[PDB]
Design a protein around this ligand. Structure first.
Ligand SMILES: Nc1ncnc2c1ncn2[C@@H]1O[C@H](COP(=O)(O)OP(=O)(O)OP(=O)(O)OP(=O)(O)OP(=O)(O)OC[C@H]2O[C@@H](n3cnc4c(N)ncnc43)[C@H](O)[C@@H]2O)[C@@H](O)[C@H]1O
Ligand SMILES: Nc1ncnc2c1ncn2[C@@H]1O[C@H](COP(=O)(O)OP(=O)(O)OP(=O)(O)OP(=O)(O)OP(=O)(O)OC[C@H]2O[C@@H](n3cnc4c(N)ncnc43)[C@H](O)[C@@H]2O)[C@@H](O)[C@H]1O
Lengths: 220, 220
């Protein structure tokens, strides 16, 4: 509808979660995230959680019945319809993408983070997470702000160096169908650069899209 | 009582979980484990779990009301009283140790794993865990048996290189009171050696203790 609606995706450890924080904090959008929702169910320890976890341990995609409608109902909440939605890690397969088209849910732009596979490994092996806040960190690039935060940092069960090669396969194998799907409003953004350097680009993009929509609104 | 009852402890990543598997499988004892029980409650996602986790994230000791009786009731089960019990990671403080003495619960021997702090770090940074089985692994020493097991290995949220220094403090600071407590039947076992090399020692120890107890049984 008229509120801004974005959709982001990319290979694992490219900067999806990191960028979304910046976008969210400024634009005030409702940040949805297929990855986080999955982990939340696991955290709660439900049957869906202990089911989903299995696929995530082998680097597999969690089956549609869990994901598709879990996302569905999050979009039904008011904030997403009034302020705007920001998808993250969805869709990830033809069927998933198609599910949304049948409900007339199409974004304004599709941002893909392009990162060379050679980089990824070291990005993930140093990634940390502060549970009390939710802020992403990295021991070298973007380290903790020398606070007690350093003592409360943790890591995901699936950030094993060798897991990466596996999660890469599932990735590019499926994105071929995605690009095909009416998502051709794809804006490829180079990820091999400063966290600030990348954001600036995504900001400028969203900024102009606001002008476009607003121009028609001001039909004089 | 007459069934064998052991109690093991040591600094983090010394080999407590690893050895217990060998002991358990051979001697047929009921293996209790304060660490595992805590993680199980978190896995289940209860109020106790989300409470306990906090302390475990900063490398703190979980408060007595959660631990003390959680262990209490596990010892009440039949198998522990009929076959024998094998404590692991308990007690860890004066109060905890004392709780057991008030119920006439005393072990046969107290095995302490002596490992030089200089080693520990690399032991923990390469530790993996197969969820489907519960077998401990390490990427270099005792690697996975070249099976699909390699694809389903995970890691704990608290195996951060820098966390180690913290968990070391809490450790030796409290063991001073433990040694003091009537636990002087301490058998120090050098941990800087092959997994088989260490086990052999623990086996021979338990083996003789069986002879001792059995001798009196055969009062001729
Ligand atoms: N739709 C769906 N269908 C089915 N199953 C689904 C599903 N969605 C999820 N799942 C499943 O759930 C599992 C987990 O998925 P998910 O948790 O979504 O993981 P992922 O997609 O693999 O991605 P990450 O979250 O690891 O990476 P990121 O790109 O967001 O990186 P970040 O910004 O943190 O950054 C990573 C690191 O790089 C850093 N960093 C960021 N930008 C830069 C930069 N420019 N330079 C240097 N460092 C940087 C950070 O500090 C950090 O250290 C999957 O395995 C799958 O099973
Ligand atoms: N009573 C209590 N009161 C309050 N709070 C409590 C509590 N009990 C627990 N908690 C809390 O819960 C948290 C977690 O505690 P807990 O989970 O109990 O952890 P821990 O005591 O720090 O010990 P680990 O399980 O890490 O080590 P381990 O010595 O068993 O090592 P392993 O044999 O796997 O081996 C480690 C690695 O070394 C390997 N390895 C084994 N032997 C050798 C060898 N000889 N040579 C080479 N590699 C070896 C393995 O392959 C593996 O890679 C604590 O932080 C605390 O908050």
């Amino acid at each position: 509808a008229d509120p801004l609606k974005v959709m982001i995706s990319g290979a694992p450890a490219s900067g999806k979660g990191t960028q979304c924080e910046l976008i969210k904090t400024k634009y005030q959008l409702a940040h949805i995230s297929a990855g986080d929702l999955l982990r939340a169910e696991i955290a709660a320890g439900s049957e869906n959680g202990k089911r989903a976890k299995e696929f995530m341990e082998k680097g597999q995609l969690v089956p549609d019945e869990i994901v598709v409608n879990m996302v569905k109902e999050r979009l039904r909440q008011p904030d997403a319809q009034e302020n705007g939605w920001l998808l993250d890690g969805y869709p990830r397969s033809y069927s998933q993408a198609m599910a949304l088209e049948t409900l007339e849910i199409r974004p304004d732009t599709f941002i893909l983070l392009d990162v060379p596979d050679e980089l990824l490994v070291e990005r993930v092996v140093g990634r940390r997470l502060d549970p009390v806040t939710g802020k992403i960190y990295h021991l070298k690039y973007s380290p903790p702000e020398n606070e007690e935060i350093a003592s409360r940092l943790t890591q995901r069960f699936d950030d094993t160096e060798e897991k990466v090669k596996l999660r890469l396969e599932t990735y590019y194998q499926n994105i071929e169908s995605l690009l095909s799907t009416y998502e051709n409003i794809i804006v490829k953004v180079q990820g091999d650069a400063t966290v600030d350097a990348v954001f600036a680009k995504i900001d400028e993009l969203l900024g102009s899209i606001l002008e476009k929509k607003n121009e028609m609104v001001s039909s004089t």
